């Protein structure tokens, strides 16, 4: 398992790419197989593969302006090649103001330079309203692109 400071460097580049709020910046630290699973398991939100998130994040970021990320807690388990962060976010969306908070579990690859698995719990009351707004927005971008 890679040295702490290398994993920690991956964590920071993930958070900074998140704050930078472009697809390429944020997805730079995700491996090709990195899955994102929404917790709790009981909410039955299907795990999301990399083709899914590569298609979502451009659309998602385009409808969140003044995105500000705030990191409250980094728990680094260098021996286990693992981490957990707590973050909060705000943005303006086509649907009104957006706020969220995130408990995020990360796993790194052997080299400690990519994130390989993501599991996350968020503000489910924010998401109950926003996920369907986002899904219909995504479908509208899809249809609009296929036409042209």
Ligand X SMILES: COC(=O)c1cc(C)cc(O)c1C(=O)c1c(O)cccc1O
Q: Which residues bind a copy of itself (CB under 8 A)?
A: 4, 39-43, 73-77, 79-80, 82-84, 86, 88, 99-101, 103, 105, 119, 121-126
Closest to a copy of itself by CB, 2 or 138: 2
Q: What value, to the nearest 5°, has the Cα angle with vertex 40 and ends 132 and 117? A: 95
Q: What value, to the nearest 5°, has the Cα angle with vertex 52 and ends 131 and 49? A: 110
Contact between 60 and ligand X per CB under 6 A: yes
* Residue 21 interacting entry, from a copy of itself, ligand X, none, C-beta within 5 to 8 Å by type: none
Q: Do β-strands 30-39 and 115-122 pair in parallel, antiparallel, or remain unpaired?
A: parallel
User: Min. distance of Cβ 124 from a copy of itself in angstroms?
Assistant: 4
Helix (H, G, I), strand (E, B) or coil at 49: coil
Q: Do β-strands 96-108 and 115-122 pair in parallel, antiparallel, or remain unpaired?
A: antiparallel
x-marked contacts with ligand X along 112-141 as a string, rule CB under 6 A: ------x-x-x-------x---x-------
Contact between 100 and ligand X per CB under 6 A: yes
CA distances, 14 to each of 6, 115, 129 (Å): 13, 8, 26
- Residue pair 62/47 in contact (Cβ under 8 Å)? The answer is no
User: Min. distance of Cβ 142 from a copy of itself in angstroms?
Assistant: 29
User: Min. distance of Cβ 118 from a copy of itself in angstroms?
Assistant: 12
């Amino acid at each position: 398992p890679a040295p702490a400071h290398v994993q920690r460097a991956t964590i920071d580049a993930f958070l900074d790419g998140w704050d930078k709020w472009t697809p390429e910046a944020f997805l730079a630290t995700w491996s090709e197989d990195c899955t994102q699973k929404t917790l709790p398991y009981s909410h039955n939100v299907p795990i999301r593969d990399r083709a899914n998130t590569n298609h979502l994040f451009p659309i998602l970021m385009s409808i969140m302006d003044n995105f500000q990320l705030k990191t409250h807690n980094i728990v680094h388990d260098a021996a286990e090649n693992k981490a957990a962060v707590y973050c909060s976010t705000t943005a303006d969306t086509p649907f009104g103001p957006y706020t969220n908070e995130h408990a995020i579990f990360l796993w790194f690859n052997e080299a400690g330079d990519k994130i390989v698995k993501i599991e996350e719990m968020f503000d489910q009351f924010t998401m109950k309203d926003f996920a369907p707004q986002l899904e219909k927005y995504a479908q509208f971008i899809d249809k609009k692109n296929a036409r042209a």
